[PDB]
Amino acid sequence: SAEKKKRITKGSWNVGYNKAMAQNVAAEKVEMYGQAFKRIQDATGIED
Amino acid sequence: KAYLRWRGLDVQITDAANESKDNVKYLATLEKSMEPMYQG
Amino acid sequence: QLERERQERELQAKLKMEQDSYEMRVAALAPKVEAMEHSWNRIRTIADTPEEVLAYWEGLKAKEEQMRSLVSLAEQRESS
């Protein structure tokens, strides 16, 4: 019990703020999918 | 008794879902230039 | 007999101690459960710290490469 608590606390300490980390991780998907869609569009337009 | 199995399946399902979304979205980008070669 | 009664009382006191300790551990159980839930959620969203750092670095590199690629494609489109 205590060892698991210490491990969890250490992991949380290493990471950044939970709210910030959660938002950053969630965003990191849109911040990439958008870019990808834009690249695919530009590609198709150039080919056309 | 079954809640260990359900949290394990939850972790597996979230990881599989995330990798599936990325894989599907990237393999879908390929489609508009792979489409000509099926019948042309 | 009085000594035996005292020994029984001492055993009861030891039990009480091994009960109070259990109680405090049980109260710490709620904190343990909260920590476990947070760790599980963080792992699912993403050893764990290294994976999160790698994911962040990969995302940043991908964004940079994406911007460079988009610029290349725009230049190619303009030339065409």
Side-chain angles (χ1 to χ4, degrees), chain A residues 1-5 11 16 20 22 26-27 34 36 43 45, chain B residues 1-30 32-40, chain C residues 13 27-28 30-31 35 47 50 55 59 62 74:
Chain A
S1 63
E3 61 86 19
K4 185 52 157 143
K5 292 179 65 179
Chain B
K1 41 177 179 297
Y3 313 128
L4 294 152
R5 292 193 291 115
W6 258 103
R7 78 207 80 157
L9 291 187
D10 276 327
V11 179
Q12 299 314 308
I13 280 299
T14 179
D15 286 314
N18 198 319
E19 205 71 15
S20 71
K21 310 328 187 203
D22 281 331
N23 278 298
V24 168
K25 286 312 173 184
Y26 277 168
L27 285 158
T29 56
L30 271 295
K32 298 182 163 184
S33 74
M34 182 180 72
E35 68 189 14
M37 266 65 74
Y38 280 81
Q39 84 278 39

